[PDB]
Every structure is written in C-alpha cells, then in structure tokens.
Amino acid sequence: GFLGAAGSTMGAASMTLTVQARNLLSGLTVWGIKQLQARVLAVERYLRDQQLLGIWGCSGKLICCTNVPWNSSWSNRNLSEIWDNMTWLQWDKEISNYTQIIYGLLEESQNQ
C-alpha cells in the first residue's frame, strides 16, 4: 500500500503513484489550535504543489510529458540503468543539485 514501492526500481514505482497521491490530503484550546495548524499546513503544501504543476502545464495529471530536452550534463546514465536498476531515493540524491535549473527551464518553456 502506502510507500510500498520505496525499495522497488523507478519503473515499478511508476505504476502506484495514486497510493501516495491520496495519502497527502486526508490520510483544551491549546491542543485544539495545534491540531488545526497541521490541517492548514497540509492544505497549503498540497495547494502549492498543485499550483506548481498547473504553472508547468501539467494540471490534473500524475505523469506529464514536457518539451524540455534532457541535458546530458545532468546525468549521463542510460534508460536501462535508471528505470531498471535504481530507486527514486537514490535518483533524488543524484539530481538534487540540478533541480532548480530544471524547474526554471520548465516554467520558462511552458510560458513561452
């Protein structure tokens, strides 16, 4: 179920995105205020993610293709050893350096 494919390859974990997608929205006065703030913060994080997806041109989608070509300087590995010999936790650690450049390229490509 939830986070079940955390140890599987990137390809195997691409077929269960809905499980993680669903578990992000609903899955005295001192304690009452504390619990309320968490519920507001989850909504805010969800709305920020949705706004980013909509700005990129990918509103209402779990997998979305773009027109931005992949620079070989971000990663030189081929598709056989990325989608079949790696997990998302390892991929994030590898591409954590180039994330902002890719996000900016996506935004400016969609706008223009």
Q: Pattern 81-100, binding to other proteins, x per CB under 8 A?
A: -xx----xx-xx--x---x-
Residues 6+ apart with CB under 8 A from 53: 59, 61, 64
Residue 51 contact among other proteins, a second copy, none, beta carbon within 5 to 8 Å by kind: a second copy
Among 47, 64, 89, 101, binds a second copy (CB under 8 A): 47
Query: Which residue in 77, 52, 56, 59 sits closest to 67, CA to CA?
Result: 56
User: What's the chain's Rg over C-alpha atoms?
Assistant: 17
How far is residue 27's CA from residue 36's CA, in Å, rounded to a whole number? Answer: 15
Which residues in this chain contact a second copy in the complex, by CB under 8 A? 15, 18, 21-22, 25-26, 29-30, 32-33, 36-37, 39-40, 43-44, 46-48, 51, 54-55, 57, 59-60, 62, 107, 111
